[PDB]
C-alpha cells in the first residue's frame, strides 16, 4: 500500500510540473529584454565598524535605518549607530555560538540564537539602564539558523531540526510549528505584510508558509544544493534564494515556479546571504569568494562588485529606506556601502 | 569640534564600550579552545568527567595556569557541514575512540569503522587543516580482555599480528594515524586512556603546550 501512495505522489508531482509548464508562455528574460540596463554600479565604503574580535555571522538593520545589530562568535551582540560608528550597546551573550540575530521593528528588543538551540530576546529599553535577557525560547532540537520579529510579542525562528516555529514571546511557548522540510532550514524571510513567510532549507527547496494556518502553501525546487539565504521582493509577490551551487534564483509566488537564474561561469562558491534593493531592481548577494556581487534583478546581468572584505561575507542587509547596504564578513568588520 | 555635548558623551560611552570589549577579548584570547568529538558511546562522557575531576555543552577547567574550554557538540542532530566552520580556529580537537567497539556493530558493520570514517572526515576537513587532533583510545581494559577471546581480524581482515594488547593496540593506532592526509600541517597526539586513570588532563596539557610552542614558532617565522 506504500507503493500505491508513492506512485500517487509521483503522479501528483508530474501534475504539478505540467501545471507549471502550462503557465509559462514567455520567460522573464524575454519580457525584460528591451528595457534599459542599470549600468555599472559603483558603491564605495562609507563607514567601517570595528570592535568585533571574532567572525561575524549575522546582522540586522532595523526600521529607523540608522541603528543596526551585529552578532559575532566572540560572544558579543553589538548595536551600532551606523551614522557615527558609535557603539550604542554591547550585550554579552550567554552562549558564544551565535549565528543569527534580529532587531525588532519597534527597536525595543533584539533577538539572537545559534548552536545552543535557544532564541534569546533582550530588552533594549529597560528602566535600569542596562540590557536584560527578556526571554529565552527553547524547543528546537537543532541550531537556530534565522529568526525574525513579527512584532514585539511574536517571533518566527528557523532551526536545523528541519522545522520552523512561531513563538509568543510573553508566554514563551511555540504558537505554531511549521514542518515539511526534509533538511536543515538555513534562512527565512518575512513578507512585507508579515502574513506569509518563505523558508529555504538544505533539501534544495523553499517553502511558503501561512502564519495563521500554519501550513505550507507552495514549494519551489530549482536549486541543486543547500539554500543558504532567502529574501522577498519588496512587493511581496516573489522571492530570491541563494544556494551553495553558486547560483541565485528568483521565484514567483503567483506563477509558482522559477523566474530567473543569476549565475556566472567564474563564480563557483556558494552564496551566504541575499538581499533586495528598495525598488527590487538590484539583488545583492554575498559570496564565499570574499566578495559581494550586485545583480540586475530584471536582466540577470551582473551590475557591480562590492570587494572590500578579507574573509567570507557572512551577512548582508539593506536599510528600509534603501540608502545604504551593510556587509558583515568573517574578518570581524562590518562595512556600510553607498 | 562639531560634536554636541550629548554627542561627546555618546562618543565617550562608545570608547568605554571599546575598552571593555578589548579587555574581554584579551581575557578570552588567553583561553584554550578544545573541540570534543567522537562516536556514540565512545567515552566522551568519561573524558569530560576526568577533566572535571582535575544543544552545545561547554566545560571549563584549569590546569597549570591554563584555562581550558571544551565544546561537546554531542547532541547536535544536524549536518556538521553547516556549523563546523564555527569551530575553525580552536586550539585543538579531542577525538574519542572506544577500543572495545572494534567488534561491535550498530546497520550491520563495525562501530570502529564509523569511528574511522568520522575521524577521516574531521581530520581531513578543509577547516581543520592546521588544527591538531588529540586522539583518545578509551576502554583499554575492556579491549585488553576482548582481544584475548575475539580476534582483531573481525575489524581488520588484513591484520596478520597476534592477539595481544600491545600489537593490536599499536596496529589500531597506526590505522587511525594513517587517515591523516595533512601530515606536514597537523600532528596527531595519541593517548591510551581508560575509565580509571588520572593522567588524561596532564596529557591534554602537554599536547596543548606542544601546539602552543609550534604556533608561537609559526608566529615568529622560525617554523
Amino acid at each position: 500500500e506504500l507503493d500505491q501512495l508513492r506512485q500517487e505522489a509521483e503522479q501528483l508531482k508530474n501534475q504539478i510540473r505540467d501545471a507549471r509548464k502550462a503557465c509559462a508562455d514567455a520567460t522573464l528574460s524575454q519580457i525584460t529584454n528591451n528595457i534599459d540596463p542599470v549600468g555599472r554600479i559603483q558603491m564605495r565604503t562609507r563607514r567601517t565598524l570595528r570592535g568585533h574580535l571574532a567572525k561575524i555571522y549575522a546582522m540586522h538593520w532595523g526600521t529607523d535605518s540608522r541603528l543596526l545589530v551585529s552578532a559575532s562568535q566572540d560572544g558579543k551582540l553589538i548595536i551600532w549607530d551606523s551614522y557615527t560608528t558609535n557603539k550604542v550597546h554591547a550585550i554579552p551573550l550567554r552562549s558564544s555560538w551565535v549565528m543569527t540575530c534580529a532587531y525588532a521593528p519597534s527597536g525595543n528588543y533584539v533577538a539572537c540564537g545559534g548552536l545552543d538551540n535557544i532564541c534569546s530576546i533582550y530588552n533594549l529599553k529597560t528602566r535600569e539602564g542596562n540590557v536584560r535577557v527578556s526571554r529565552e525560547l527553547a524547543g528546537h532540537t537543532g541550531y537556530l539558523s534565522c529568526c525574525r520579529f513579527l512584532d514585539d510579542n511574536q517571533i518566527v525562528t528557523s532551526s536545523g531540526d528541519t522545522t520552523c516555529a512561531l513563538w509568543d514571546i510573553e508566554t514563551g511557548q511555540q504558537t505554531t510549528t511549521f514542518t515539511g522540510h526534509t533538511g536543515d532550514v538555513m534562512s527565512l524571510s518575512l513578507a512585507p505584510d508579515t502574513r506569509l513567510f518563505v523558508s529555504g532549507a538544505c533539501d534544495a527547496s523553499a517553502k511558503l508558509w501561512d502564519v495563521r494556518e500554519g501550513m505550507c502553501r507552495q514549494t519551489f525546487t530549482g536549486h541543486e544544493s543547500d539554500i543558504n539565504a532567502i529574501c522577498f521582493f519588496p512587493n511581496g509577490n516573489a522571492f530570491a534564494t541563494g544556494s551553495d551551487d553558486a547560483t541565485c534564483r528568483l521565484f514567483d509566488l503567483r506563477a509558482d515556479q522559477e523566474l530567473m537564474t543569476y549565475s556566472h561561469d567564474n563564480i563557483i562558491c556558494g552564496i551566504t546571504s541575499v538581499s533586495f534593493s528598495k525598488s527590487g531592481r538590484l539583488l545583492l548577494a554575498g559570496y564565499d569568494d570574499f566578495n559581494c556581487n550586485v545583480w540586475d534583478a530584471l536582466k540577470a546581468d551582473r551590475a557591480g562588485v562590492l570587494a572590500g572584505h578579507d574573509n567570507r561575507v557572512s551577512c548582508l542587509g539593506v536599510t528600509d529606506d534603501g540608502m545604504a547596504v551593510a556587509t558583515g564578513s568573517w574578518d570581524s568588520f562590518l562595512k556600510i556601502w553607498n | 569640534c562639531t560634536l554636541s555635548a550629548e554627542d561627546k558623551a555618546a562618543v565617550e560611552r562608545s570608547k568605554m564600550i571599546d575598552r571593555n570589549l578589548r579587555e574581554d577579548g584579551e581575557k578570552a584570547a588567553r583561553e584554550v579552545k578544545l573541540l570534543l568529538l567522537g562516536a556514540g558511546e565512545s567515552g566522551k562522557s568519561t573524558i569530560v568527567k576526568q577533566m572535571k575531576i582535575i544543544g552545545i555543552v561547554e566545560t571549563h577547567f584549569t590546569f597549570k595556569d591554563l584555562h581550558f574550554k571544551m565544546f561537546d557538540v554531542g547532541g547536535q542532530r544536524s549536518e556538521r557541514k553547516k556549523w563546523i566552520h564555527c569551530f575553525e580556529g580552536v586550539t585543538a580537537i579531542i577525538f574519542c575512540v572506544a577500543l572495545s567497539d572494534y567488534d561491535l556493530v550498530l546497520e550491520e558493520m563495525n562501530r570502529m569503522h564509523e569511528s574511522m570514517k568520522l575521524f577521516d572526515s574531521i581530520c581531513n576537513n578543509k577547516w581543520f587543516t592546521d588544527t591538531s587532533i588529540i586522539l583518545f583510545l578509551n576502554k583499554k581494559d575492556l579491549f585488553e580482555e576482548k582481544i584475548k577471546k575475539s580476534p582483531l581480524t573481525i575489524c581488520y581482515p588484513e591484520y596478520a599480528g597476534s592477539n595481544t594488547y600491545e600489537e593490536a593496540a599499536a596496529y589500531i593506532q597506526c590505522q587511525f594515524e594513517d587517515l591523516n592526509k595533512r601530515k606536514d600541517t597537523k600532528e596527531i597526539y595519541t593517548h591510551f586512556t581508560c575509565a580509571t586513570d588520572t593522567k588524561n588532563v596532564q596529557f591534554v596539557f602537554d599536547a596543548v603546550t606542544d601546539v602552543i610552542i609550534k604556533n608561537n614558532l609559526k608566529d615568529c617565522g622560525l617554523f
Epitope: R66, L67, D81, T84, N86, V88, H89, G107, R127, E128, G129, N130 | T2, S4, A5, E6, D7, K8, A9, A10, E12, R13, K15, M16
Partner: single-chain antibody, 235 residues
Framework: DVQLVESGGGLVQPGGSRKLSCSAS????????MHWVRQAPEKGLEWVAY????????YYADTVKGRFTISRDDPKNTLFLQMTSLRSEDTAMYYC??????????????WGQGTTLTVSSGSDIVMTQATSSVPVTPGESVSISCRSS???????????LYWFLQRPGQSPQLLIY???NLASGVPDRFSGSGSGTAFTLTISRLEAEDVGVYYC?????????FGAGTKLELK
C-alpha cells in the same frame, strides 16, 4: 524601582565645608553620568556639577568652580559633592540626577529626593520663560512658552531642549527631552514643539496633578542653564 537618596545637608557656617552623598539603587549606576543640580529656596533650578560614566569628563558651573568637587564610587554606587569655602549664596536644595547618553536615550530621566543645605549668617545660553505664572482650569488646554538666546538646533538635527515639571513638595520630573520626545511614563497630553530659539510646551485636557512649576532647559552648550520657571495654579 530606581531611587536616589541625598544625605549630608544641614546648617553650615560661612566659609565651611560639607560632603553631600547620593546613594543610588535600582539601576546600573556605573553606566549613568551624574549631575548635581541646585534649587535656591524661593528661586528656580540651577545646574552645579557633572561627572560622566567612568569619570572621564567632569564639568562645573562657573559659580562653584574651584570650591566644589564632584566624584563617584561605582562599586559603592554612590556620588559625592565636596563643598569648600561655602558662601551664603550656596544655601539651597541639592538633587542628584542620573543621565545616560547614547542614540535615542533620555537624559535627566530620574531625579533624587534632594538634600537641604543652609549656609548660616556672559557666553552662556539664557533661557527665558517670560510668564511667571498662569491660572488654569482642569480639563482645559494650556501652553507654556520658552525662549533661548542662542539657537538650540544642532547640525545633526537634534534640538537640545528639555522640559521638566516640579510638583509642589516634589523633585522635578522629566516630561519632554530634545523638544519633541515624551519621557517614559508621561501621559500623552504633554506635547513639545518649537524651532530654533522659540519653544512651547502644550498640555491638552490638563488634570489636577499637572499643577506645578514648568522649567525650560538647554543641553547644547555644556554650561547647562535652566529657565526661570512657569508656575501653574488653579482657580
Amino acid at each position: 524601582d530606581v531611587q536616589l537618596v541625598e544625605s549630608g545637608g544641614g546648617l553650615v557656617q560661612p566659609g565651611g565645608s560639607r560632603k553631600l552623598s547620593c546613594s543610588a539603587s535600582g539601576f546600573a549606576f556605573s553606566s549613568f553620568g551624574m549631575h548635581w543640580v541646585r534649587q535656591a529656596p524661593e528661586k528656580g533650578l540651577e545646574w552645579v556639577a557633572y561627572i560622566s560614566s567612568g569619570s572621564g569628563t567632569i564639568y562645573y558651573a562657573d559659580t562653584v568652580k574651584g570650591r566644589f568637587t564632584i566624584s563617584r564610587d561605582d562599586p559603592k554606587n554612590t556620588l559625592f559633592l565636596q563643598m569648600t569655602s561655602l558662601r551664603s549664596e550656596d544655601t539651597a536644595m541639592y538633587y542628584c540626577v542620573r543621565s545616560i547618553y547614547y542614540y535615542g536615550s533620555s537624559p535627566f530621566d530620574f531625579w533624587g529626593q534632594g538634600t537641604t543645605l543652609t549656609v548660616s549668617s556672559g557666553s552662556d545660553i539664557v533661557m527665558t520663560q517670560a510668564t511667571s505664572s498662569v491660572p488654569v482650569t482642569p480639563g482645559e488646554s494650556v501652553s507654556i512658552s520658552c525662549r533661548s538666546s542662542k539657537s538650540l538646533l544642532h547640525s545633526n538635527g537634534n534640538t537640545y531642549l528639555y522640559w521638566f515639571l516640579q510638583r509642589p513638595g516634589q523633585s522635578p520630573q522629566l516630561l519632554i527631552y530634545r523638544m519633541s520626545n515624551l519621557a517614559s511614563g508621561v501621559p500623552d497630553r504633554f506635547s513639545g514643539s518649537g524651532s530654533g530659539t522659540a519653544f512651547t510646551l502644550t498640555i491638552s485636557r490638563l488634570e489636577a496633578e499637572d499643577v506645578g512649576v514648568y522649567y525650560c532647559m538647554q543641553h547644547l552648550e555644556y554650561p547647562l542653564t535652566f529657565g526661570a520657571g512657569t508656575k501653574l495654579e488653579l482657580k
